[PDB]
Design a protein around this ligand. Structure first.
Ligand SMILES: *[C@@H]1O[C@H](CO)[C@@H](O[C@@H]2O[C@H](CO)[C@@H](O[C@@H]3O[C@H](CO)[C@@H](O[C@@H]4O[C@H](CO)[C@@H](O[C@@H]5O[C@H](CO)[C@@H](O[C@@H]6O[C@H](CO)[C@@H](O)[C@H](O)[C@@H]6O)[C@H](O)[C@@H]5O)[C@H](O)[C@@H]4O)[C@H](O)[C@@H]3O)[C@H](O)[C@H]2NC(C)=O)[C@H](O)[C@H]1NC(C)=O
Ligand SMILES: *[C@@H]1O[C@H](CO)[C@@H](O[C@@H]2O[C@H](CO)[C@@H](O[C@H]3O[C@H](CO[C@@H]4O[C@H](CO)[C@@H](O)[C@H](O)[C@@H]4O)[C@@H](O[C@@H]4O[C@H](CO)[C@@H](O)[C@H](O)[C@@H]4O)[C@H](O)[C@@H]3O)[C@H](O)[C@H]2NC(C)=O)[C@H](O)[C@H]1NC(C)=O
Ligand SMILES: *[C@@H]1O[C@H](CO)[C@@H](O[C@@H]2O[C@H](CO)[C@@H](O)[C@H](O)[C@H]2NC(C)=O)[C@H](O)[C@H]1NC(C)=O
Ligand SMILES: O[C@H]1[C@H](O)[C@@H](O)[C@H](O)[C@@H](O)[C@H]1O
Ligand SMILES: O[C@H]1[C@H](O)[C@@H](O)[C@H](O)[C@@H](O)[C@H]1O
Ligand SMILES: [Fe+3]
Ligand SMILES: [Zn+2]
Ligand SMILES: [Zn+2]
Length: 341
């Protein structure tokens, strides 16, 4: 066997990867980059093998020839008896979240408010909400819609980064990695929870995992679900229990990608790695758990039950679905058939 070189995005992922490398006995090793885009370039050069990507990034990687290998699979209810690895993925719900106390803020009065985004180019944090906003406003000036934002990956001197905080020292403001205080699902929800923004564009799971004591993190300790509302497209506000009827879209699960010529090798290694360090793995929680990182979703989402085989050997377009692909295509017209690298 050859080793698999995993690509870690930023210093916190690098630390988790190093631990996994040690525990795997160097069956997995680590390369590190500052952004997801740079990790994708590493994979293309053949300097790294794989990383787990949000749907929006799978689109970028796909244009450049990378293929989906295995998908994150979280808890379900349907397909009960079927093993996690073979169970179809269900997809997550992209939602827009506000404080209950911010009364009369609805989908239709979002203009000139403050926004919290997981990162530019990501499914729930960006592509879905901004795609809808462009369509509804007939304008590609989505950078003038919100008064101020935190959208990791945008220009640090623009309004889109105005609310981003950087790291401990206030360095790396708006970098699309976990060094940025408000990056990712948990970061964007924190941006709302601390009332830096009026709205966060996250997924349904984020609200549940960071309220009612599900998170012992300082800022999330006292957060109650009832203090939050979801914004529906029909102009209403619902309790966070109603996400099935009040979401902006269903997103395809985050998935491991690699170069096509390395796909089968990456697959084999990962299946074995999860038997050891996965949810009921030999060595988890005794030595190391691949799918834990204390609420920080490092390398993988913390709610990941397993990585699932795909079936139908999907291309990246099949994986993302024709609905989502055309949504992205239409939005990319603002800022068509190539590879950004
Ligand atoms: C937005 O995000 C949230 C966070 O991701 C989502 O909430 C999460 O939902 C999942 C399920 O989708 C939860 O997992 C469950 O958590 C339970 C409690 O911790 C766990 O323990 C039990 O598991 C049992 C087995 O499932 C459950 O017993 C039954 O299970 C079966 C189906 O498997 C059913 O059987 C029925 O029982 C009926 C009894 O009245 C009977 O009348 C019927 O005839 C039938 O026999 C039944 O459904 C029943 O539940 C038991 O209920 C417990 O759940 C378990 O592991 C389970 O998987 C997460 O815990 C939730 N996360 C959090 C933090 O709350 C939310 O779903 C999502 N929203 C949307 C719309 O997607
Ligand atoms: C922003 O605005 C953009 C412009 O309006 C939006 O893009 C448009 O999005 C539409 C929906 O994704 C595209 O239509 C495509 O899907 C159609 C429906 O597919 C079929 O639907 C029927 C009924 O539900 C099913 O029975 C069937 O199985 C298909 O799923 C397509 O119509 C059909 O396509 C099939 C292809 O196999 C064809 O055989 C049929 O004859 C029939 O024509 C259609 O072809 C499209 O693929 C629009 O094309 C698209 N517009 C543009 C400019 O591309 C965008 O979504 C908006 N953004 C957001 C975030 O919402
Ligand atoms: C590192 O990879 C190797 C190869 O998969 C593993 O070593 C053994 O592989 C052989 C042949 O495939 C199997 O018969 C054994 O099951 C493996 N050894 C054991 C004891 O399980 C090895 O498991 C990997 N090491 C770690 C820690 O991930
Ligand atoms: O596909 C994406 C997208 O086009 C972004 O606008 C660009 O900043 C990224 O580098 C690219 O990978
Ligand atoms: O249309 C289907 C669907 O998108 C599945 O998720 C994928 O696994 C299949 O390969 C594809 O044919
Ligand atoms: Fe996502
Ligand atoms: Zn829906
Ligand atoms: Zn196919």
């Amino acid at each position: 066997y050859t080793r698999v070189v995993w690509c870690a995005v930023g210093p916190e992922e690098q630390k988790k990867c190093q631990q996994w490398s040690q525990q795997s006995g160097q069956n997995v090793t680590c390369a590190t980059a500052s952004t997801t885009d740079d990790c994708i370039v590493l994979v293309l050069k053949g300097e790294a093998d794989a990383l787990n990507l949000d749907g929006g990034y799978i689109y970028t990687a796909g244009k450049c020839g990378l293929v989906p290998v295995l998908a994150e699979n979280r808890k379900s209810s349907k397909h009960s008896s079927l093993d996690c690895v073979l169970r179809p993925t269900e997809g997550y719900l992209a939602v827009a979240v506000v404080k209950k106390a911010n009364e009369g803020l609805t989908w239709n009065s979002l203009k000139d408010k403050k926004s919290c985004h997981t990162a530019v180019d990501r499914t729930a944090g960006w592509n879905i909400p901004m795609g809808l906003i462009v369509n509804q406003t007939g304008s590609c000036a989505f950078d003038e819609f919100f008064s101020q934002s935190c959208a990791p990956g945008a220009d640090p001197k623009s309004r889109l980064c105005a609310l981003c905080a950087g790291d401990d020292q206030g360095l790396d403001k708006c970098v699309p990695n976990s060094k940025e205080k408000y990056y990712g699902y948990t970061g964007a929800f924190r941006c709302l929870a601390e009332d830096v923004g009026d709205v966060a564009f996250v997924k349904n799971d984020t609200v549940w995992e960071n309220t009612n004591g599900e998170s012992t993190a300082d800022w999330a300790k006292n957060l109650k679900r009832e203090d939050f509302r979801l914004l529906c497209l029909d102009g209403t506000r619902k309790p966070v229990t109603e996400a099935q009827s009040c979401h902006l879209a269903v997103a395809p699960n985050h998935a491991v990608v690699s170069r096509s010529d390395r796909a089968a090798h990456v697959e084999q290694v990962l299946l074995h790695q999860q038997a050891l360090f996965g949810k009921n793995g030999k060595n988890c929680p005794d030595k190391f758990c691949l799918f834990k990182s204390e609420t920080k979703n490092l390398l993988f989402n913390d709610n990941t039950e397993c990585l699932a085989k795909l079936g139908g050997r999907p291309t990246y377009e099949e994986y993302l679905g024709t609905e989502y692909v055309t949504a992205i295509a239409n939005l990319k017209k603002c800022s068509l058939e190539a590879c950004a690298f």
